[PDB]
Amino acid sequence: TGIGTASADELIAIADAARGAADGEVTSIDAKRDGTWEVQLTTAAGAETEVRVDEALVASVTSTDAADGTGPALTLDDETIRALVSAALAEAEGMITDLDVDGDDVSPYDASVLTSDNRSIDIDFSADFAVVGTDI
Amino acid sequence: TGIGTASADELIAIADAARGAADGEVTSIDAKRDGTWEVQLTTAAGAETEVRVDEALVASVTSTDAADGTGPALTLDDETIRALVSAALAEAEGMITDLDVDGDDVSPYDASVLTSDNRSIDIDFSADFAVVGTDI
Ligand SMILES: [U]
Ligand SMILES: [U]
Ligand SMILES: [U]
Ligand SMILES: [U]
Ligand SMILES: [U]
Ligand SMILES: [U]
Ligand SMILES: [U]
Ligand SMILES: [U]
Ligand SMILES: [Zn+2]
Ligand SMILES: [Zn+2]
Ligand SMILES: [Zn+2]
Ligand SMILES: [Zn+2]
Ligand SMILES: [Zn+2]
Ligand SMILES: [Zn+2]
Ligand SMILES: [Zn+2]
Ligand SMILES: [Zn+2]
Ligand SMILES: [Zn+2]
Ligand SMILES: [Zn+2]
């Protein structure tokens, strides 16, 4: 794939990840061909560790709104995210920026595509994943 | 920046990160302009949570080699990674694939650049960060 990075900041992040999984100072950062990195740490003594370092996602709660006093009928289960992402990218090419199942019940799903133009396209979909609305 | 993704797989990863920080099924995935995502989860009851989701790096130990029976004189401290990454990219443009301070003592530092050509350039540097060697 596109193995490697041009970012000192990323390499430093990868050194830092490894630095907290084992003792010793960093003596090698190496891109494996899957997408992961191997970092070698090395103690004053000469003890070598090898640390795998992967892209992770960390999730922290930001807000909260207790029960108004209805759950959701539909949801962004894995099926549903994959449908919307095709449907949306078919209708307009670019980066997906928003998916929601909030909607207005006859258009239950929404996606926002961002485009080279830096022009946002708010797309509206039927329960059956057909385009029913655009806003460019 | 390049806000968004064309990857259902990434959105599903982001939904999954959030799914494990709070209860409820996912009803919104939204890219914030820093680089993070907000996921809204929603319980059967109607309780909304918002979850921040960031790029993280996770580090797991892979191997180990106890003391042969010398630590490292030099190391890839943050200073040193930033020097090598410029020095290397100056000498040859592309993605950095390896940094090491193993070397042969008169060339204490090494970098590997990967290039559009898919041609690897193994570069060799003095303690003073000058190029002393290439291998194309
Ligand atoms: U390795
Ligand atoms: U990621
Ligand atoms: U909320
Ligand atoms: U949204
Ligand atoms: U938000
Ligand atoms: U990253
Ligand atoms: U090792
Ligand atoms: U290396
Ligand atoms: Zn609130
Ligand atoms: Zn899943
Ligand atoms: Zn489903
Ligand atoms: Zn709608
Ligand atoms: Zn809309
Ligand atoms: Zn071993
Ligand atoms: Zn640091
Ligand atoms: Zn230093
Ligand atoms: Zn060398
Ligand atoms: Zn070399």
Q: How far is the CA of A54 from the centre of ligand 4 (A)?
A: 28
Q: A81, B29: Cβ pair inside 8 Å?
A: yes
Residues of A in contact with B22 (CB under 8 A): 59, 61
Establish if A27 touches chain B: CB-CB under 8 angstroms. yes
Yes or no: say if A39 and A50 are a contact pair by the CB < 8 Å rule: yes
Experimental method: X-ray
Contact by Cβ (8 Å): A3, B97: yes
Nearest residue of chain B to residue A24 (CA atoms): B71
* Cβ pair B63:A49 closer than 8 A: yes
- Which ranges in B20-135 belong to alpha helices (H)? 78-91
The continuous run of DSSP H or E covering B13 comes out as helix B8-19
Total CB pairs under 8 A between chain A and B: 246
Cβ-based neighbours of B99, under 8 Å, separated by 6 or more:
A11, A28, A29, B76, B81, B84, B85, B109, B110, B111
Which residues share a beta bridge with B98? A30, B112
Q: In the structure encoding, which two tokens stand for residue B130, read together? A: 């000058």
Report CB contact under 8 Å: B8, A70: no
- Specify the resolution in Å: 2.9
Contact criterion met (CB below 8 Å) for B85 and B96 = yes
Count how many residues are written for chain B.
136
Residue type for position B108: P
Burial class (CB in 10 A: 0-12, 13-18, 19+), B16: middle
Chain A closest-CA separation from residue B79 CA (Å): 9
Within the 58-77 window of chain A, which residues sit less than 8 Å (CB to CB) from chain B?
58-72, 75-77
The answer to whether the beta carbons of residues A127 and A74 sit under 8 Å apart is: yes
Round to whole Å and give the CA distance between B1 and A118: 10
For residue A10, give the amino acid letter.
E
**A chain contacts of residue B51, beta-carbon cutoff 8 Å:** 59-62
Phi, psi (deg, nearest 5) at residue A133: -175, 140
At the topology level, CATH places domain A78-133 in Nuclear Transport Factor 2; Chain: A, (3.10.450)
Displacement of CA A44 from its chain's centroid (Å): 38
Nearest Cα residue to A57 out of B19, B42, B30 = B19
Tokens of B84: 């090598």
Helices (H) and strands (E) in chain B, counts: 2, 7
Contact by Cβ (8 Å): B41, B51:
yes
Closest ligand to C-alpha of residue B106 is 17
B98 vs A: CB within 8 A: yes
Q: Which helix (H) or strand (E) holds B56?
A: strand B48-65
The C-alpha atoms of residue B115 and residue B98 are separated, in whole angstroms, by 13
- Which DSSP letter does residue B21 get? T
Q: What is the DSSP string of chain A?
A: ---SBS-HHHHHHHHHHHHTTS-SEEEEEEE-TTS-EEEEEE-TT--EEEEEEEEEEEEEEEEEE-------SS---HHHHHHHHHHHHHHS-SEEEEEES-TTSSS-EEEEEE-TTS--EEEEE-TTS-EEE---
Closest by CA position to A81, among listed B49, B16, B3, B1: B16
Task: Concatenate the DSSP letters of all residues of B60-80 into one string.
Answer: EEEEEE-------SS---HHH
Q: Is B129 left (phi over 0), alpha (psi -120 to 50) or beta?
A: left
Say which of A7, A89, A97 has its CB closest to residue B3: A97
Measured in angstroms, the CA of B126 and the nearest CA of chain A are apart by: 16
Count of all residues that appear for chain A in the document: 136
Cβ separation A49–B64 shorter than 8 A: yes
User: Closest partner residue to B76 among A15, A56, A70, by Cβ?
Assistant: A15
Residue B38 forms contact with A (CB below 8 Å): yes
Taking Cα atoms as reference points, which of B97, B96, B103 lies closest to residue B74?
B103
**Where do the domains of chain B lie?**
8-53, 78-133
